[PDB]
């Protein structure tokens, strides 16, 4: 109404932030950035609610204004800077590195990666199009535009970004039998080794996916993120590796140790 909104009430923020409904009227509205508002960590939730490295929103500002936190190798002093899937967070103190990946329950999980694994990232290409002066470029899922890509790169593929220069190191093609990571939908946070996809000319592609335990499920194409060949992936998968155990089997595992 009359212009863009700037406040985000609680009970209206995305449910995967895990914000307690009481203790506050508002929620951190993610700023404009590489990732959608609906799928965004931004650091205030990450620093305080996930890592417990702050007690308030004031201490988060104190941490960020001293250039400790950085996203993709850049300081990102903004307190509500939207951090999305596959973003790499580096903290100079504690010598810790992070990669934003979804837990099997559909939530962003705290994942600690080594220094070497923080030297790259994967991005799902969204469109391959010619720029001005006939310069082709690829647009990844985090808004990164990379000029002069490989001619064999097509949409729905995954490229590897150096994160020191925006150059592409290697790319994974979208073919049957590739290890994929489900990003969005009821099957969010699952890893499933594509078997085949349905064409459905007109829109809303469908792909059939079955994980290691031979559980098959179907999700829309735009929710699929290829993360390498079957078996060894190109990133360190979080604990559980996206299995989606049933509730009956889950409690027995919780009852195994107590």
């Amino acid at each position: 109404a009359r212009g863009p909104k700037k406040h985000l009430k609680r009970l209206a923020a995305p449910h995967h932030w895990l914000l307690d409904k009481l203790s506050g009227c508002y929620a951190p509205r993610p700023s404009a950035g590489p990732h959608k508002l609906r799928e965004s960590l931004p650091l205030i939730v990450f620093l305080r609610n996930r890592l417990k490295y702050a007690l308030n929103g004031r201490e988060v500002k104190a941490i960020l204004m001293q250039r400790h936190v950085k996203v993709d190798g850049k300081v990102r002093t903004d307190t509500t800077y939207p951090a999305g899937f596959m973003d790499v967070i580096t903290l100079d103190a504690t010598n810790e590195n992070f990669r934003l990946v979804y837990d099997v329950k559909g939530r962003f999980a705290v994942h600690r990666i080594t220094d070497e694994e923080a030297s790259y990232k994967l991005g799902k290409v969204k469109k391959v199009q010619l720029g001005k002066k006939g310069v082709p470029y690829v647009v990844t899922h985090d808004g990164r535009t990379i000029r002069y890509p490989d001619p064999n790169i097509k949409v729905n593929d995954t490229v590897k970004i150096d994160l020191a220069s925006g150059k592409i190191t290697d790319f994974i093609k979208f073919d049957a039998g590739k290890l994929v990571y489900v990003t969005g939908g009821r099957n969010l946070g699952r890893i499933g080794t594509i078997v085949h996809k349905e064409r459905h000319d007109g829109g809303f592609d469908l792909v059939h996916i079955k994980d290691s335990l031979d559980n098959t499920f179907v999700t829309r194409l735009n929710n699929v993120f290829v993360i390498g060949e079957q078996g060894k992936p190109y990133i360190s998968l979080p604990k559980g590796k996206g299995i989606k155990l049933s509730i009956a089997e889950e409690r027995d595992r919780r009852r195994a140790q107590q």
């Binding site: 417990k52 490295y53 702050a54 007690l55 004031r58 201490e59 104190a62 941490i63 400790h68 903290l91 103190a93 504690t94």
Partner: protein
């Protein structure tokens, strides 16, 4: 006092704010309400840094008494504790003094009076006095 047996749980190191965060767990049988001023001293000795770099808050006494659980922070030095701690808690321990200030309504009305004046206002002061003669 008598079997104070201060315990700190869930201790985590936070060099980003240059401190340590832990949950203070205090047992005070036959006694009540361990009175943080004493809590800071014993907490300071355990981490042996100083008293001025130690702050505590929370400490809701359990039902029936005999126990109290709160929060505590231990900084690396006074410089960190004097730059990250809130002003309201620094004045609790005497490390800072509560600056004198008028009421909220007094400042609001004073600010609105300024809005009615364009420029510094020295020129109208002499002009008002000159017109006050006649």
């Amino acid at each position: 006092s008598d079997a104070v047996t201060i315990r700190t749980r869930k201790v985590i190191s936070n060099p980003l704010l240059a401190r340590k965060q832990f949950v203070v767990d205090v047992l005070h049988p036959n006694r009540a309400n361990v009175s943080k001023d004493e809590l800071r001293e014993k907490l300071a000795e355990v981490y042996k840094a100083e008293k001025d770099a130690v702050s505590v808050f929370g400490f809701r006494t359990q039902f029936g008494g005999g126990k109290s659980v709160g929060f505590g922070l231990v900084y690396n030095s006074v410089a960190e504790a004097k730059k990250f701690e809130p002003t309201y808690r620094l004045v609790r321990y005497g490390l800072a003094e509560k600056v004198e200030k008028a009421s909220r309504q007094q400042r609001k009305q004073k600010k609105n009076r300024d809005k009615k004046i364009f420029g510094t206002g020295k020129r109208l002061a002499k002009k008002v006095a000159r017109r006050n003669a006649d």
